Design goal:
Protein name: Cyclin-dependent kinase 2
Number of strands: 8
Strand order of the largest sheet: 1-2-3-5-4
CATH architecture of the largest domain: Orthogonal Bundle
Largest sheet: 5 strands, antiparallel
CATH topology of the largest domain: Transferase(Phosphotransferase), domain 1
Helix content: 25-40%
EC number: 2.7.11.22
Bound molecules: the ligand O=C(O)c1cc(C(F)(F)F)ccc1NCCc1[nH]nc2ccccc12
CATH class of the largest domain: Mainly Alpha
Number of domains: 2
Pfam families: Pkinase (PF00069)
Structural class: alpha+beta
Enzyme class: transferase
InterPro entries: CDK, Kinase-like_dom_sf, Prot_kinase_dom, Protein_kinase_ATP_BS, Ser/Thr_kinase_AS
Length: about 280
């Protein structure tokens, strides 16, 4: 092959990912997985500092070559579990991810499957969106983590909006703050009911049309809503305000990435350097 393998980075949703070096000396992430070939190639001209760079597409099996980053946010949260990620670093990462999402969404690209282990970090303080769930959206063929899935997806919405990524990022924000997953369900209905028990069972008042969702059942239990002071306790009122807007049930009420960037929570945002053990 044109690539000397270094290690298997892991198993994505679409296939294996390897750390490999180009035999240019470049160290890359090599993901293994037409007419979609045209769409995927468009993404390569679209670049943003908070999106992992797609270097090459090769159909011969489908291969995607990405820039390599040494650690993901899931590993960093685990490493930081005794102390917690410092709030200025949580704030910088959230701000950067919202910048990345605002870029994607302005180009009508959804991520669809945001989770800590798809968020890649470097020693310089950057964080970048990786492992986009774009196969289905492009028509590409061939245990799932549901913890970050928006409620309209779980209720069988046929068309996703950009709001699904804001929901996921809100769940990630909460987990960075509390050091524990916000909604750790193990089935679609367990995920849904974990959301309902915390945020209240949605009705037509807070979510017009929810009772017409394909998978909505009138026999859903009716749980009342808790208080965000209980949900992410340490977080100040600016962060709790922003989080509540990223977790609105109604996708139309849920804050956009660009509006979130103007939220007062980010008035004092900085770019700290993380302590990384590689
Ligand atoms: O991330 C992956 O694994 C991945 C998988 C596939 C598929 F083949 F599975 F469909 C396609 C693209 C993939 N990433 C594209 C990253 C990217 N570059 N520029 C972008 C601008 C805006 C939004 C995203 C952008």
């Amino acid at each position: 092959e044109n690539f000397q393998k270094v290690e298997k980075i892991g198993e994505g949703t679409y296939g294996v990912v390897y750390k490999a070096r180009n035999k240019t000396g470049e160290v890359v992430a090599l993901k293994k997985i037409s007419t979609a070939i045209r769409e995927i190639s468009l993404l390569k001209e679209l670049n943003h500092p908070n999106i992992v760079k797609l270097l090459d597409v090769i159909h011969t099996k489908l291969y995607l070559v990405f820039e390599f980053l040494h650690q993901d946010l899931k590993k960093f949260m685990d490493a930081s579990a005794l102390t917690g990620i410092p709030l200025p670093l949580i704030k910088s990462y959230l701000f950067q991810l919202l910048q990345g999402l605002a870029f994607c969404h302005s180009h009508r690209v959804l991520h669809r499957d945001l989770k800590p282990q798809n968020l890649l970090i470097n020693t310089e303080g950057a964080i970048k969106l990786a492992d986009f769930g774009l196969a289905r959206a492009f028509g590409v063929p061939v245990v799932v983590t549901l913890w970050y899935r928006a409620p309209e997806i779980l209720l069988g919405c046929k068309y996703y909006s950009t709001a699904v990524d804001i929901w996921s990022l809100g769940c990630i924000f909460a987990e960075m703050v509390t050091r524990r997953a916000l909604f750790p369900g193990d089935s679609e209905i367990d995920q849904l009911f974990r959301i309902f028990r915390t945020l209240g069972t949605p009705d037509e008042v807070v979510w017009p049309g929810v009772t017409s969702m394909p998978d909505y059942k009138p026999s859903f239990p009716k749980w009342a809503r808790q208080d965000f002071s209980k949900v992410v306790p340490p977080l100040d009122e600016d962060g709790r305000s922003l989080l509540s807007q990223m977790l609105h049930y109604d996708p139309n009420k849920r804050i956009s990435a660009k509006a979130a960037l103007a939220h007062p929570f980010f008035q004092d945002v900085t770019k700290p350097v993380p302590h990384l053990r590689l």
